[PDB]
Design an enzyme around this catalytic site. Structure first.
Site, PDB file in Angstrom:
ATOM      1  N   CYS A 113       0.835  -1.205   0.000  1.00  0.00           N
ATOM      2  CA  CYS A 113       0.000   0.000   0.000  1.00  0.00           C
ATOM      3  C   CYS A 113       0.870   1.254   0.000  1.00  0.00           C
ATOM      4  CB  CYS A 113      -0.956   0.036   1.201  1.00  0.00           C
ATOM      5  SG  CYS A 113      -1.877   1.617   1.265  1.00  0.00           S
ATOM      6  N   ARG A 116      -0.192   4.656   2.937  1.00  0.00           N
ATOM      7  CA  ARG A 116      -0.195   4.318   4.361  1.00  0.00           C
ATOM      8  C   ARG A 116       0.126   5.479   5.287  1.00  0.00           C
ATOM      9  NH1 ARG A 116       3.676  -0.497   4.995  1.00  0.00           N
ATOM     10  NH2 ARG A 116       4.436   0.212   2.929  1.00  0.00           N
ATOM     11  N   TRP A 285      -9.282   6.584  -0.853  1.00  0.00           N
ATOM     12  CA  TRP A 285      -9.514   7.397  -2.038  1.00  0.00           C
ATOM     13  C   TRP A 285      -8.535   6.957  -3.118  1.00  0.00           C
ATOM     14  CZ3 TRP A 285      -8.374   9.610   2.756  1.00  0.00           C
ATOM     15  CH2 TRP A 285      -7.032   9.970   2.967  1.00  0.00           C
ATOM     16  N   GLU A 290      -4.345   4.387 -10.709  1.00  0.00           N
ATOM     17  CA  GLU A 290      -5.133   3.162 -10.606  1.00  0.00           C
ATOM     18  C   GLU A 290      -6.285   3.159 -11.607  1.00  0.00           C
ATOM     19  OE1 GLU A 290      -5.892   1.793  -6.277  1.00  0.00           O
ATOM     20  OE2 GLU A 290      -5.427   3.920  -6.004  1.00  0.00           O
TER      21      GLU A 290
HETATM   22  C1  HEM Z   1      -6.426   6.344   1.943  1.00  0.00           C
HETATM   23  C2  HEM Z   1      -6.074   6.278   0.650  1.00  0.00           C
HETATM   24  C3  HEM Z   1      -5.413   5.021   0.036  1.00  0.00           C
HETATM   25  C4  HEM Z   1      -4.692   5.043  -1.100  1.00  0.00           C
HETATM   26  C5  HEM Z   1      -4.421   6.321  -1.913  1.00  0.00           C
HETATM   27  C6  HEM Z   1      -4.222   3.693  -1.387  1.00  0.00           C
HETATM   28  C7  HEM Z   1      -3.445   3.301  -2.475  1.00  0.00           C
HETATM   29  C8  HEM Z   1      -3.110   1.995  -2.804  1.00  0.00           C
HETATM   30  C9  HEM Z   1      -2.545   1.459  -4.044  1.00  0.00           C
HETATM   31  C10 HEM Z   1      -2.182   2.244  -5.323  1.00  0.00           C
HETATM   32  C11 HEM Z   1      -2.372   0.142  -3.889  1.00  0.00           C
HETATM   33  C12 HEM Z   1      -1.834  -0.840  -4.949  1.00  0.00           C
HETATM   34  C13 HEM Z   1      -3.055  -1.676  -5.336  1.00  0.00           C
HETATM   35  C14 HEM Z   1      -3.229  -1.759  -6.823  1.00  0.00           C
HETATM   36  O1  HEM Z   1      -2.446  -1.109  -7.577  1.00  0.00           O
HETATM   37  O2  HEM Z   1      -4.155  -2.492  -7.253  1.00  0.00           O
HETATM   38  C15 HEM Z   1      -2.824  -0.232  -2.561  1.00  0.00           C
HETATM   39  C16 HEM Z   1      -2.824  -1.503  -2.009  1.00  0.00           C
HETATM   40  C17 HEM Z   1      -3.302  -1.899  -0.763  1.00  0.00           C
HETATM   41  N1  HEM Z   1      -3.821  -1.067   0.219  1.00  0.00           N
HETATM   42 FE1  HEM Z   1      -3.838   0.933   0.075  1.00  0.00          FE
HETATM   43  N2  HEM Z   1      -4.726   2.868  -0.373  1.00  0.00           N
HETATM   44  C18 HEM Z   1      -5.475   3.647   0.520  1.00  0.00           C
HETATM   45  C19 HEM Z   1      -6.160   3.207   1.660  1.00  0.00           C
HETATM   46  C20 HEM Z   1      -6.082   1.950   2.222  1.00  0.00           C
HETATM   47  C21 HEM Z   1      -6.824   1.457   3.381  1.00  0.00           C
HETATM   48  C22 HEM Z   1      -7.910   2.284   4.160  1.00  0.00           C
HETATM   49  C23 HEM Z   1      -6.431   0.181   3.578  1.00  0.00           C
HETATM   50  C24 HEM Z   1      -6.849  -0.847   4.649  1.00  0.00           C
HETATM   51  C25 HEM Z   1      -7.417  -0.482   5.801  1.00  0.00           C
HETATM   52  C26 HEM Z   1      -5.416  -0.152   2.584  1.00  0.00           C
HETATM   53  C27 HEM Z   1      -4.745  -1.353   2.470  1.00  0.00           C
HETATM   54  C28 HEM Z   1      -4.182  -1.835   1.308  1.00  0.00           C
HETATM   55  C29 HEM Z   1      -3.859  -3.209   0.989  1.00  0.00           C
HETATM   56  C30 HEM Z   1      -4.094  -4.376   1.970  1.00  0.00           C
HETATM   57  C31 HEM Z   1      -3.313  -3.255  -0.259  1.00  0.00           C
HETATM   58  C32 HEM Z   1      -2.813  -4.491  -1.068  1.00  0.00           C
HETATM   59  C33 HEM Z   1      -1.763  -5.324  -0.366  1.00  0.00           C
HETATM   60  C34 HEM Z   1      -1.597  -6.677  -1.034  1.00  0.00           C
HETATM   61  O3  HEM Z   1      -1.747  -6.811  -2.287  1.00  0.00           O
HETATM   62  O4  HEM Z   1      -1.321  -7.637  -0.285  1.00  0.00           O
HETATM   63  N3  HEM Z   1      -5.228   0.953   1.784  1.00  0.00           N
HETATM   64  N4  HEM Z   1      -3.255   0.924  -1.943  1.00  0.00           N
HETATM   65  C1  LIG Z   2      -8.608   1.334  -0.056  1.00  0.00           C
HETATM   66  C2  LIG Z   2      -7.867   1.460  -1.376  1.00  0.00           C
HETATM   67  C3  LIG Z   2      -7.516   2.708  -1.882  1.00  0.00           C
HETATM   68  C4  LIG Z   2      -6.842   2.780  -3.110  1.00  0.00           C
HETATM   69  N1  LIG Z   2      -6.471   3.957  -3.663  1.00  0.00           N
HETATM   70  N2  LIG Z   2      -6.544   1.654  -3.772  1.00  0.00           N
HETATM   71  C5  LIG Z   2      -6.863   0.439  -3.297  1.00  0.00           C
HETATM   72  C6  LIG Z   2      -6.477  -0.792  -4.086  1.00  0.00           C
HETATM   73  O1  LIG Z   2      -6.098  -1.744  -3.108  1.00  0.00           O
HETATM   74  C7  LIG Z   2      -6.069  -3.082  -3.374  1.00  0.00           C
HETATM   75  C8  LIG Z   2      -6.049  -3.519  -4.686  1.00  0.00           C
HETATM   76  C9  LIG Z   2      -6.013  -4.876  -4.955  1.00  0.00           C
HETATM   77  C10 LIG Z   2      -5.979  -5.329  -6.389  1.00  0.00           C
HETATM   78  C11 LIG Z   2      -5.806  -6.838  -6.475  1.00  0.00           C
HETATM   79  N3  LIG Z   2      -5.222  -7.175  -7.778  1.00  0.00           N
HETATM   80  C12 LIG Z   2      -5.652  -6.223  -8.820  1.00  0.00           C
HETATM   81  C13 LIG Z   2      -5.032  -6.641 -10.129  1.00  0.00           C
HETATM   82  C14 LIG Z   2      -5.147  -7.923 -10.459  1.00  0.00           C
HETATM   83  C15 LIG Z   2      -5.028  -8.838  -9.499  1.00  0.00           C
HETATM   84  C16 LIG Z   2      -5.623  -8.542  -8.143  1.00  0.00           C
HETATM   85  C17 LIG Z   2      -5.997  -5.795  -3.919  1.00  0.00           C
HETATM   86  C18 LIG Z   2      -6.031  -5.350  -2.600  1.00  0.00           C
HETATM   87  F1  LIG Z   2      -6.030  -6.241  -1.595  1.00  0.00           F
HETATM   88  C19 LIG Z   2      -6.064  -3.992  -2.326  1.00  0.00           C
HETATM   89  F2  LIG Z   2      -6.102  -3.564  -1.045  1.00  0.00           F
HETATM   90  C20 LIG Z   2      -7.520   0.305  -2.081  1.00  0.00           C
END
Ligand code: HEM
Ligand SMILES: Cc1cc(N)nc(COc2cc(CCN3CCCCC3)cc(F)c2F)c1
Ligand code: HEM
Ligand SMILES: Cc1cc(N)nc(COc2cc(CCN3CCCCC3)cc(F)c2F)c1
Ligand SMILES: C[C@H](O)[C@H](O)[C@H]1CNc2nc(N)[nH]c(=O)c2N1
Ligand SMILES: C[C@H](O)[C@H](O)[C@H]1CNc2nc(N)[nH]c(=O)c2N1
Ligand SMILES: [Zn+2]
Lengths: 415, 415
Positions: A113, A116, A285, A290
């Site tokens: 993430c 964070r 948000w 993305e």
């Molecule tokens: C507040 C604004 C937030 C932004 C801008 C943000 C941004 C991102 C981005 C760009 C990713 C990569 C996922 C992807 O590209 O598909 C990600 C992954 C992730 N975020 Fe954040 N996120 C936010 C909030 C949160 C919150 C509230 C949580 C949990 C309480 C969280 C937990 C996670 C987790 C668990 C992943 C993926 C980890 C994995 O693949 O194991 N995020 N986030």
């Molecule tokens: C709260 C929040 C904010 C933000 N701005 N963005 C995200 C995106 O967060 C995740 C995104 C994925 C994507 C999983 N993945 C996508 C591509 C293909 C394979 C599976 C898995 C997760 F667990 C995530 F928390 C979450």
């Protein structure tokens, strides 16, 4: 045992001792690195009562360490109290304050993430008294309304009852609360979102009457205490959407693109103290990329680089003209602009990545480290003009954490 | 013990057994991944005679396995022959055919190299009879002329005598054969290439008379058999350069940008059969992004995004305008165009990455795998519109290999 990470843009060096507290495994060995495997077996989630108490003890100790009351009377009594309850029930229940701490630190520890820096500002909704799909729907709607906050978005998570036997499991079958439907055509092409095409088929298999368009918000599929899931439609007044226009191209409205304001992941597992919360949707948000890079321009998602290059009148003959790169930057100037002109919270990949470096600095100071997955932190465009490209990052698994879990339709003993 | 990697754009799955032959270590453990550390201690290079023979045996066995003559008479006699020579001298000498094989497979095994589809088309220059800096200069000039081939570039490597005692070492002190000089100013700003500023100071410390401009080709610093290095100037007729113009902007010549056609890395170590070649410069051709993204737009390199945004008249006030992304795509359309209009070999990051996927396919078939470092393979712009973003990759260390080595001025016992 006191590792060092460097930033090769500023020569900043930080010292990581946090990885010493690490517990779970990564997938790499001394002889092979798995750093680019998407869903490693150590990221995916059935437990017994012997292993439970150490996991509870480990969690309760860090919680009381964090309120400057480590090993005191309230700590020792709660340690014995959870011990007692794990004999009685072979499980246990978290205090409200314990749930909030564990929930926030699952996010803090989420190494993929990039957002964070906000981990401490997270709103925790305790849904553990819920018993039906309808109640799940009610809790999810209040989540959506709260986190959306009229476009001034707010981080939040809603936690449904913890798994127990494993066959009475609470599960949101949507991968995100708000997603657009995906339907295939006669010729095999795909309308809407090609990712959700299987889920869209399941919803119609349960009786969804599809409007069979592009940006059709999918209905919720909610499984409660192991029962078969039921369909519910989020009231449209609660689904906020931003239509995408460009601040130069008056043909960009003609593209007719729009995206929902709220990213809300619902399909993953929250692990606290050894307890498994199989349904725990969380929202924040969007970062621009993305939507404008992955959602819009992935080959097997919306795949619009084809059309944006056309209206721009680009050299689409040869690959080395970088017409693909050129239409990709315009799409992202557009997503950002469109969200920003509607007061809907969004963040560009540059400010988000700078803030993550700032966040990393604070985590190495007041915590001794910060697990980070370079493969996922670097944005999917313009990699090296952002400060995270040049930052070495140590990845390791701390708990509480968010884990991937299998889809319920491959596991749910149906009826 | 039969691992699987997936491409999440095409659903292609390949099977890796090659990692079983792997020997050296990675830096990761089961509890921490080092995948984004720039120069891990397992990538950097003093050896004895006991460990030497197994390393020679391991290499000779794969060589004879590759000519469909494994374990035969010629294999067994050469195994005993190298054994004999390692008793006599406590070292040994490679056959010409053995040097060519080892050299080519060092590149084949280079997991951070995206251009490896060409690994079998590599021209090997045997410089192991060289004894002086002047001879080194002669060999390097013939290398430059040959690989440049009037802009129709050709892959090549020149291998100087192997290390022995360790204090009689052959070393090219330049990190690349052709690089532009870097000089700091009174106010502290930097003219030329800010990377090479320390090397430029060393060359003037040895007596270089600097023309103190921007794109001033640096002279060679050549150390022979452990003697103090000496300065030599590549004849300018041999240094081919491409001035950068844009196919739309008639103000792009006014930028006055140019780059050398030949990427030729000189500072690293070739390891074959246990023998260490401390000087082994190798050249191929540029991928566009290495110049137009990293060289031109890194904050601590040439840093031109500032100026390209100006002449384009871009919204430089706010960061979320993506003015940086927009000037970055124009610079790379320009590098490509400029090189291509001069018949000088260059490859765009899209065709290079597609070819790498093609290469990976062949390596999993006729070899059972292909070590790859996602962190380095994905291009530094437009990551996810290229097919390598979506390809899982297993990283592991096979030998023969190229290794990093410390700079000689931190180690050379001077005089
Ligand atoms: C507040 C604004 C937030 C932004 C801008 C943000 C941004 C991102 C981005 C760009 C990713 C990569 C996922 C992807 O590209 O598909 C990600 C992954 C992730 N975020 Fe954040 N996120 C936010 C909030 C949160 C919150 C509230 C949580 C949990 C309480 C969280 C937990 C996670 C987790 C668990 C992943 C993926 C980890 C994995 O693949 O194991 N995020 N986030
Ligand atoms: C709260 C929040 C904010 C933000 N701005 N963005 C995200 C995106 O967060 C995740 C995104 C994925 C994507 C999983 N993945 C996508 C591509 C293909 C394979 C599976 C898995 C997760 F667990 C995530 F928390 C979450
Ligand atoms: C023929 C055209 C070639 C192309 C287009 C190419 C491209 C690249 C690129 C983009 C990188 C990443 C380096 C960076 O971004 O700074 C790289 C790394 C590398 N290449 Fe290739 N290269 C070519 C030829 C060669 C040859 C001839 C050799 C050796 C014989 C070689 C061996 C390596 C090595 C050892 C690395 C770095 C590995 C490390 O950091 O440990 N390449 N190449
Ligand atoms: C033959 C060739 C062709 C090509 N197209 N490109 C290259 C670039 O290859 C390398 C590039 C580096 C860069 C080292 N790195 C740069 C940034 C800062 C830190 C040090 C190290 C190596 F060993 C390489 F082989 C080589
Ligand atoms: C193959 C690779 O593991 C996969 O494409 C990953 C790479 N990094 C990513 N990074 C983010 N933020 N999101 C992703 O979906 C991915 N996909
Ligand atoms: C911090 C990180 O290890 C470092 O910036 C790496 C990332 N990946 C890279 N990839 C390539 N091709 N070239 C580089 O210089 C780097 N730098
Ligand atoms: Zn690893």
């Amino acid at each position: 045992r006191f590792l060092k990470v460097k930033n090769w843009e500023t020569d900043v060096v930080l010292t990581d001792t946090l990885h010493l507290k690490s517990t779970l495994e990564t997938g790499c060995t001394e002889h092979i690195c798995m750093g680019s495997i998407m869903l490693p077996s150590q990221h995916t989630r059935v437990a017994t009562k012997d292993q439970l108490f150490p996991l509870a003890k480990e969690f309760l100790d860090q919680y009381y360490s964090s309120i400057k009351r480590f090993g005191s009377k309230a700590h020792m009594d709660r340690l014995e109290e959870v011990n007692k309850e794990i004999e009685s029930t072979s499980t246990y229940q978290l205090k409200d304050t314990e749930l909030i701490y564990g929930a926030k630190h699952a996010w803090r520890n989420a190494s993929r993430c990039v957002g964070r820096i906000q981990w401490s500002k997270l709103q925790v909704f305790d849904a553990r008294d819920c018993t039906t799909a309808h109640g799940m729907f009610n809790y999810i709607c209040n989540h959506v309304k709260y986190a959306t906050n009229k476009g001034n978005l707010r981080s939040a998570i809603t936690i449904f009852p913890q798994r127990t036997d494993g066959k009475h499991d609470f599960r949101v079958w949507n991968s995100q609360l708000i997603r657009y439907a995906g339907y295939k055509q006669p010729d095999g092409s795909t309308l809407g979102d090609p990712a959700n095409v299987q889920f869209t088929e399941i919803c119609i298999q349960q009786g969804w009457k599809a409007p069979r368009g592009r940006f059709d918000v999918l209905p919720l599929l909610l499984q409660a205490n192991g029962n078969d899931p039921e369909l519910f439609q989020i009231p449209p007044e609660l689904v906020l959407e931003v239509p995408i226009r460009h601040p130069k191209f008056d043909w960009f409205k003609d593209l007719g693109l729009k995206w929902y304001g709220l990213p809300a992941v619902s399909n993953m597992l929250l692990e606290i103290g050894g307890l498994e919360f199989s349904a725990c949707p969380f929202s924040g948000w969007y970062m621009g990329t993305e939507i404008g890079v992955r959602d819009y321009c992935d080959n097997s998602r919306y795949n619009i680089l084809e059309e944006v290059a056309k209206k721009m009148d680009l050299d689409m003959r040869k690959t080395s003209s970088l017409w693909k790169d050129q239409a990709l930057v315009e799409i992202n100037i557009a997503v950002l602009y469109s969200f920003q002109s509607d007061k809907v919270t969004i963040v560009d990949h540059h400010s988000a990545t700078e803030s993550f470096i700032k966040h990393m600095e604070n985590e190495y100071r007041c915590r001794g480290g910060c697990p980070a997955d370079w493969v996922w932190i670097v944005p999917p465009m313009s990699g090296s003009i952002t400060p995270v490209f040049h930052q070495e990052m140590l990845n390791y698994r701390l708990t509480p954490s968010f884990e991937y879990q299998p889809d319920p339709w491959n596991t749910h003993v149906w009826k």
